[PDB]
């Protein structure tokens, strides 16, 4: 087996060879077993929205040409996509909702493991929302912020504040004019499910305008999730750590935190440190907590917990034979982990009521009991460590250095060292003079269809050479960090001369004796919202709307419904947005034309669907340069 | 073409022959063009929940055996079903939400076309909810009831009151114990979408318990919708009208009201009466408003508007060439109507923002402007009538007499004529003595897979002969009414001797000089909730829970996601529930076993999946008789 065709990560390749020796089936094996995949589903031309179905439409040829109810290709494709957006919105905003409840519990005195850690963030959010702070206790301001967050999930006398208060007013006005401002987060999710059900909305434009609106409900959930997590757990600032499977340690209790919401795993980090002497008792050096996927990102950003792996290669951490526990919340967890555990010895633990996996051990996490849960979980891990006394392990000796923690506040602080009272100005100055060509946000998943990380690294390398300021989140940040893009030692090799000068100037002003890393890690997938905050602050400072800025986004290897939602609100807020896998839209040319062209006329943004990464990088550069030309700037 | 293989309705058959002459494609033609349908989708063994897909699992044989992420057949089947329930819940509860807003507008003075028509219903709902009425104005009690309705869509300090206040406390306690009581209607819809998204819930039992909970959010939306529609438009009482295509009149302006929410179509009924002289001016006799689907049911129940047709045969009304307008809200409208209109001359009009159809004319209905909208719409219809001056039409001369309007209040009133102060007792007495064997609720759609009405009539005929009290809603009521089951003249032919004696005793006590009809029409699909109210009142009166009563349900020809949701809450509240088409569950034996067997242990109810209607009738009789035996009654 040529393992480079599966993953470009060498640690992953090493574990693919071990899995193949050992007979352990992987995601890649399960993909091969699926080929050829259904061409109706690939093109979007399948509907199962009622029990007359399943319906399909031939992309070309003869009948069937139309759904049994009369639904055209246009309708079928748009309804499918809409439901994917709604599903993504449900995940991000479910995460946010859970943190809103957690904050309320904290400040009501019902969960003393949680607290207001970032009081400055709390007060700033309150002021953005219009919540009064003067003469109020912190707990009462917090209570009010949690109330406001929960209120945005339903209809009320205002629209969703975690949209209307986070974008420029001019953007809010353009979106309002088209009826795109969500009325309530769960309200919009529900309306999508209604309108896409049989015999309801059957006009592609109408359907896709609803999808745009629902993508803003997803944005709101993202931003809410970042705001509340920062209050509770601290706003990230720059941190130095490591990534890839080599961060596992044979002589330690290796515990992965995996999923998205870090509400327990932020506690598992703090508790694990207390339980060092109990680990040594069991003959370990200590507990080694490592991250997978976005819960990993969260604790990497705030605590510098090393990232073990991401997305499509998550099973490989188990294949080492050194992963004593994998502690799961929700989202992006291949349920194969529960069966692979039988072979590898790993204790897989679920913790959220609505996210269980057959064959995994469940712990009923509650905030009020967060410490005692953590200790129970870590004591299963220590027991699992002891069970592999005298078992050889194969941990690839492969890791990278990672500098991360670039929240928007952190980036503004860093810039402030160059201009204390106008911190955005040094960035704008260098956009204007061409040292920075523009900004690209890498976001989203890996996808088994694409050799792991190949699109992120191929595109990022072309953009960096062309002096684009590259920011990343989620498993796009994961890809980039595991390939060295977060190590400032690689700035000379990766970055154009203009970008290098800027990264160096900022880093030297921040006392580093060198540069910021090539790529700025802005956090988890909800922390795509931090990129919004940065770009909206730029917009405000420039007195223009986001669809005039030289800012693009790339979901270069997208997988999840969440990633579809994020791509869609990136287009809705005015960004040219690349997707590097085919969404199920090609079976309708009119819907494709809306999403890739005529939506420009509505929001200013638009999808760029391009599976060849070299070609995608050129198209993203063209988009950036078109924005530069619109502002009258050289390019 | 043998048209009896498509529909058992002779009017439909006549219009199928006309469509075939004229070259007009129908739903049946589009079905034939779809065959053979995809066997993955038929069995549920297809997933498109991420961009790694589409995934499928062979029902039998060799690979693929598992989804690319590891998702088993069990998981894939349960997630698909869950999303169908959520979609149904979104439709019913979207309808309810819209009526909650309408009521608020009414009583705030913002829409003087709407008002509190049923003050007794208002006050009773307020008292059920715990809303105080003593010394309060009607408008303020209404405002409070609308507030409460909207509050049930989100989390709060109570659970969904339109569940917990409408079921027996013992049923609420059984459901609470299993964690099945919804926390908020849109909250549950969103949580379903989250938990079924990639990498989240992956345990069939956990997934299906969430589905049960979400089906109760659907119940809540149903019940809310019936409550609010009764306040605004009046609670139904017995009414005499007609059904089938013969209710169209060549010399009149024929206007169909079609969809579900009647918020404008209740106004179109009242306004149409005012516009008689304007119709005569255009050379019509007057405006003839007729119903299709559940908006038709709503205005049949309250106003005795004749029902033209239902569900799968809706296009046939157009094929007559006499349907001048079809006025659409949302749900269950084959979008083919917009194209068939080009051929037939019919003006198809949409009226709801989130439900448009390419090629239809849109009118932006607003409550504040309800009368002026109605007149605009009716004036398009009159213009269309004039355009078919001297055009032969083919209206099959085929209609039935329909007695309907059996709300729960109406049924209780009717019974009260036999026992004024214990109105349920005469019904219970006749269950106990075997005159009434049990109760069956027919519900749900027609489905092109099943020759139209064949399952409803075949099953109903066997049950009626066995003295079952048969109640119906939606297009199950439609089926039954078009085949004569709502004409009391057919009681001798259709009903067993015990049922006939009861229907006759009630009818004679109500001054009729004969019987109630064979089948009691309890209204639209949301008015399945009325059957819940009746069965819960019986439960309360008997001091037992619903899963001990001899009450079953049959969705004999189900189609819509809404129908899946209704079937699922019928099982959740404790009913043996027949479905006469295959839901996409057969690809997982463990999920099938849960839904058809082990769910009994949780809720007392269970699905009966049976495509042969004779066999289904025997299984439904067996279920009824098993309940009789449990109560110690002969059978
Ligand atoms: S909604 Fe229409 S296209 Fe979809 S499965 Fe049902 S009949 Fe087919
Ligand atoms: S969620 Fe799993 S089974 Fe479904 S499409 Fe994605 S990889 Fe396939
Ligand atoms: S026909 Fe394959 S995705 Fe439905
Ligand atoms: S493979 Fe046909 S429904 Fe997906
Ligand atoms: C990722 N959300
Ligand atoms: C039907 N609902
Ligand atoms: Fe993520
Ligand atoms: Fe209906």
């Amino acid at each position: 087996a040529r393992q480079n065709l599966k993953s470009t990560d060498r640690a992953v390749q090493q574990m693919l060879d071990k899995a193949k020796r050992e007979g352990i089936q992987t995601v890649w094996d399960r993909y091969e077993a699926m080929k050829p995949q259904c061409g109706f589903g690939e093109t979007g031309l399948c509907c199962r929205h009622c029990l007359q179905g399943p319906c399909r439409i031939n992309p070309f040829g003869d009948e069937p040409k139309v759904g049994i109810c009369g639904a055209t290709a246009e309708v079928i494709v748009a309804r499918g996509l809409d439901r994917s957006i709604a599903a993504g919105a449900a995940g991000h905003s479910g995460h946010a909702k859970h943190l809103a409840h957690t904050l309320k519990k904290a400040v009501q005195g019902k969960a003393a493991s949680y607290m207001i850690k970032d009081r400055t963030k709390l007060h700033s959010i309150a002021k953005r929302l219009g919540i009064p702070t003067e003469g109020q206790k912190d707990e009462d301001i917090a209570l009010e912020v949690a109330k406001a967050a929960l209120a945005d999930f339903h209809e009320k006398d205002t629209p969703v504040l975690w949209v209307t208060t986070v974008l420029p007013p001019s953007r809010v006005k353009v979106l309002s004019a088209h009826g795109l401002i969500p009325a309530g987060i769960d309200h919009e999710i529900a309306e999508i499910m209604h309108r896409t059900s049989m015999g309801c909305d059957a006009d592609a434009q109408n359907l896709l305008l609803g999808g745009l609106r629902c993508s803003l409900a997803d944005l709101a959930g993202c931003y809410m999730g970042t705001d509340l997590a920062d209050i509770l757990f601290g706003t990230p600032a720059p941190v130095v750590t490591e990534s890839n499977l080599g961060v596992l340690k044979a002589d330690a209790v290796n515990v992965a935190v995996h999923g998205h919401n870090p509400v327990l795993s932020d506690i598992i980090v703090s508790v694990s440190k207390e339980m060092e002497n109990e680990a040594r008792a069991a003959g370990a050096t200590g507990i080694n907590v490592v991250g997978i996927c976005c819960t990993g990102n969260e604790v990497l950003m705030r605590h510098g917990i090393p990232a073990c792996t991401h997305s499509v290669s998550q099973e490989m951490a188990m294949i080492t034979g050194a992963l004593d526990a994998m502690i799961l919340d929700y989202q992006c967890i291949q349920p194969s982990v529960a069966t692979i555990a039988e072979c590898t010895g790993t204790t897989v633990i679920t913790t959220m009521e609505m996210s269980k996996i057959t064959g995994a051990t469940h712990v009923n996490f509650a905030e009020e009991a967060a410490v005692e849960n953590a200790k129970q979980i870590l004591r299963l891990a220590i027991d699992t460590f002891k069970r592999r006394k005298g078992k050889p392990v194969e941990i690839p000796n492969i890791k990278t250095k990672v500098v991360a923690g670039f929240s928007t506040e952190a980036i503004i602080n860093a810039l402030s060292k160059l201009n204390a009272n106008d911190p955005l100005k040094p960035l704008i100055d260098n956009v204007v003079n061409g040292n920075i060509r523009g900004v690209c946000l890498f976001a989203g998943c890996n996808n088994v269809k694409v050799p792991q990380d190949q699109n992120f690294t191929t595109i990022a390398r072309k953009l960096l050479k062309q002096n684009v300021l590259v920011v990343a989140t989620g498993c796009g940040a994961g890809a980039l960090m595991r390939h060295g893009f977060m190590d400032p030692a690689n700035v000379d090799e990766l970055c154009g001369d203009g970008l290098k000068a800027v990264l160096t100037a900022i880093g030297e002003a921040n006392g580093l004796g060198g540069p910021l890393p090539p790529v700025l890690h802005m956090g988890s997938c909800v922390d795509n919202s931090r990129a919004v905050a940065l770009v909206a602050a730029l917009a405000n400072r420039l007195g223009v709307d986001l669809d005039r800025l030289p800012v693009v986004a790339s979901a270069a290897e997208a997988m999840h419904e969440k990633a579809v939602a994020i791509g869609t609100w990136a287009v809705t807020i005015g960004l040219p947005t690349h997707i590097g896998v085919l969404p199920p839209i090609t079976g309708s040319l009119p819907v494709t034309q809306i999403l890739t062209s005529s939506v420009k006329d509505i929001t200013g943004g638009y999808f760029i669907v391009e599976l060849d990464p070299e070609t995608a990088a050129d198209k993203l550069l063209a988009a950036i340069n078109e924005r530069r030309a619109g502002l009258g700037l050289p390019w």
Side-chain angles (χ1 to χ4, degrees), chain A residues 252-419:
Chain A
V253 189
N254 299 287
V255 184
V257 292
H258 183 13
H260 279 65
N261 196 306
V263 58
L264 172 56
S265 284
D266 207 88
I267 304 299
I268 278 156
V269 164
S270 50
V271 173
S272 69
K273 291 151 133 21
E274 311 208 309
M275 285 185 66
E276 168 175 61
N277 289 124
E278 197 171 334
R280 305 174 174 290
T285 52
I287 300 178
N288 183 48
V289 177
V290 307
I292 298 178
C293 286
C294 276
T295 290
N297 279 315
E298 299 280 8
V299 295
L300 183 144
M301 287 290 286
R302 296 192 175 77
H303 302 113
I305 292 290
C308 181
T309 197
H310 305 90
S311 188
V312 70
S313 59
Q314 61 185 269
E315 303 163 307
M316 296 306 103
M318 312 181 73
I319 303 294
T320 64
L323 191 69
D324 300 307
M326 177 186 285
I327 304 172
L328 304 181
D329 49 265
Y330 39 69
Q331 305 166 12
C332 300
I333 296 139
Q334 286 177 35
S336 63
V337 301
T339 73
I340 280 163
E342 303 174 354
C343 276
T344 64
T346 302
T347 299
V348 176
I349 297 156
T350 55
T351 66
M352 290 312 132
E353 194 55 41
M354 49 49 81
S355 200
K356 295 182 186 181
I357 311 174
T358 307
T361 277
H362 193 67
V363 173
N364 326 293
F365 154 79
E367 294 104 302
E368 17 286 306
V371 168
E372 284 323 284
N373 307 156
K375 279 183 192 216
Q376 174 182 350
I377 290 159
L378 291 171
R379 277 153 169 143
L380 295 171
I382 292 163
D383 286 356
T384 306
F385 174 87
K386 283 193 261 198
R387 281 203 295 285
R388 72 165 164 94
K389 196 158 347 220
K391 211 119 13 175
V393 298
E394 192 188 321
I395 299 161
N397 192 37
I398 295 168
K399 58 189 182 168
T400 53
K401 172 183 172 167
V402 173
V403 175
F406 295 104
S407 66
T408 299
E409 289 86 355
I411 292 174
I412 289 169
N413 180 56
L415 289 166
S416 79
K417 301 314 165 148
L418 299 173
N419 188 326

Side-chain angles (χ1 to χ4, degrees), chain A residues 92 260 294 331-332 444-445 525-526 528 560 562-563 566:
Chain A
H92 289 135
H260 279 65
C294 276
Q331 305 166 12
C332 300
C445 320
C525 290
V526 292
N528 282 309
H560 201 280
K562 285 179 291 150
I566 290 161

Side-chain angles (χ1 to χ4, degrees), chain A residues 18-39:
Chain A
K18 184 168 189 283
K20 174 178 175 90
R21 294 203 287 282
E22 301 180 348
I24 301 170
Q25 183 184 68
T26 77
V27 59
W28 286 272
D29 301 322
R30 294 187 306 266
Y31 173 54
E32 187 72 15
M34 202 62 70
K35 290 169 180 195
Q37 291 179 97
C38 179

Side-chain angles (χ1 to χ4, degrees), chain A residues 104-115:
Chain A
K104 196 194 289 185
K105 291 168 169 176
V107 298
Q108 278 170 346
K110 320 191 151 147
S113 263
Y114 302 81
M115 61 204 74

